[PDB]
Design a binder for this molecule. Sequence first.
Ligand SMILES: O=c1ccn([C@@H]2O[C@H](COP(=O)(O)OP(=O)(O)O)[C@@H](O)[C@H]2O)c(=O)[nH]1
Ligand SMILES: O=c1ccn([C@@H]2O[C@H](COP(=O)(O)OP(=O)(O)O)[C@@H](O)[C@H]2O)c(=O)[nH]1
Lengths: 264, 264
Amino acid sequence: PQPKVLTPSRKDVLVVTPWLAPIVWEGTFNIDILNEQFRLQNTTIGLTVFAIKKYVAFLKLFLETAEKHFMVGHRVHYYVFTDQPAAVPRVTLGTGRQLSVLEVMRRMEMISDFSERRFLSEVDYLVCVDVDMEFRDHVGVEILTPLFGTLHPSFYGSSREAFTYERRPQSQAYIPKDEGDFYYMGAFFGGSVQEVQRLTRACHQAMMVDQANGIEAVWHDESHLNKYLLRHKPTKVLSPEYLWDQQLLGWPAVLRKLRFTAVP
Amino acid sequence: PQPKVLTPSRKDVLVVTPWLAPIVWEGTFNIDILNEQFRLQNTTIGLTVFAIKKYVAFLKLFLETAEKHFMVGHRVHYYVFTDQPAAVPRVTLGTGRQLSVLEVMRRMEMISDFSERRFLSEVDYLVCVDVDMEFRDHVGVEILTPLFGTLHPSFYGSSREAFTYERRPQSQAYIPKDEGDFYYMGAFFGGSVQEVQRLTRACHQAMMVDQANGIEAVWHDESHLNKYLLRHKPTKVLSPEYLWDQQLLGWPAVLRKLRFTAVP
Ligand SMILES: O=c1ccn([C@@H]2O[C@H](COP(=O)(O)OP(=O)(O)O)[C@@H](O)[C@H]2O)c(=O)[nH]1
Ligand SMILES: O=c1ccn([C@@H]2O[C@H](COP(=O)(O)OP(=O)(O)O)[C@@H](O)[C@H]2O)c(=O)[nH]1
């Protein structure tokens, strides 16, 4: 179809940030056009996931649903970080899709180390998510951009003084009470390999300083992620369609699709 | 202020294309944030303008108004292409701003040649406009992106079969009747130096082929510009606030600012 300049793509939600980064909601994008632009570059997407201790139990559904909904038609490489390589279930993968097992403050440190490895040279973007989740609907190249965060589903409706940023000024994650654009969740972020290198390195180095000063930020790496994305603004922001909990929050009308949701 | 996820930045216009490029309207951007991000990189903007024959008469107002409204606070280098160097008026410039005179199918060919010169090595973005115009209001770094076009003020409300694309299939500028996103005007386009190299080279090479085949596209380089931007989609699109004619079109309510307008 033809975009119509005089008709809003959505009349109920903000679809662009004040720094002109798209906020990704159903009805904002034509997936056919995006798929073509990304296929033209033979894009490869790395997906990182941690499954430590009892969390290995979530991988089977996480992977099977990824195969149905995540970047289908594109090249995908899953990187599973685990303390149990033998517990990784053997999930059949579509063509162009691969999985590697990496045996293991941790997430940022580890992604930062892995992100700098030469075997990542084929990969174009990295997407970093929680494992206690399942895909229910399309998650595709509409998310891909140099740097993106995701709105925490519990705060997208909130004002900034209510955001659980780190408020102690001795913490590297410190954000003053009248500062802040959005509250991003540490459960889904990513960007090009270079931007994810920069982000995870910055968060890891900041946390190290906090540790050397006897402070642990209130929400741990998520606090440092919010500090980083305040100072280095994401080039796309994912709407809560991309990170949801239907048991705790239902299915409000503003969410036309629930794409990637908590497992009960 | 704080962006509010549940409140549209505009309820009367489309603010993002179906490929997630921002469409730049007043109320979509916080200029303070954009100015800071661009100052952090010490951005230099080149502005190209042609003033041939009687058109040299428009430079004095074009330049004086540019100095009031165009990229103020950033580094700017005007490139005036003229058959009359002595007719270039001597306009006083703000700090960080410079002007060069270049003595002269033409616009694309010439920008393409100039855009590949090494003396452009300081410049980060190129903006290419008509000279029979004046700035009335802010035109700033909100436009800057790898590739942008501007909606032709006469067609932003139209359907695509009404767009004056080149319709003969022997022309390189050929666009089929059920294809097309927008009709862009050849009076205001730009992007990073590299994307403007690519665009002007493509349009110039396409026109050369049309000439070698005894065809002139209906709207000349604007036809080839539309063909190029159909196949290589702009990363921002400027709303008609950025290219207007108040004598012919008035001041409709959807235009909250008239930034860059035709001289009567
Ligand atoms: O014992 C654990 C605790 C956490 N995690 C990983 O760290 C993420 C964050 O924990 P939860 O998912 O427990 O955190 P929120 O994402 O903080 O609910 C999980 O998704 C897993 O990917 C893990 O693998 N094993
Ligand atoms: O004799 C001419 C004709 C055109 N132009 C340049 O080419 C642009 C396009 O012409 P007009 O402005 O006459 O074209 P539209 O932009 O086609 O009205 C002008 O803005 C000038 O920048 C010029 O300098 N001298």
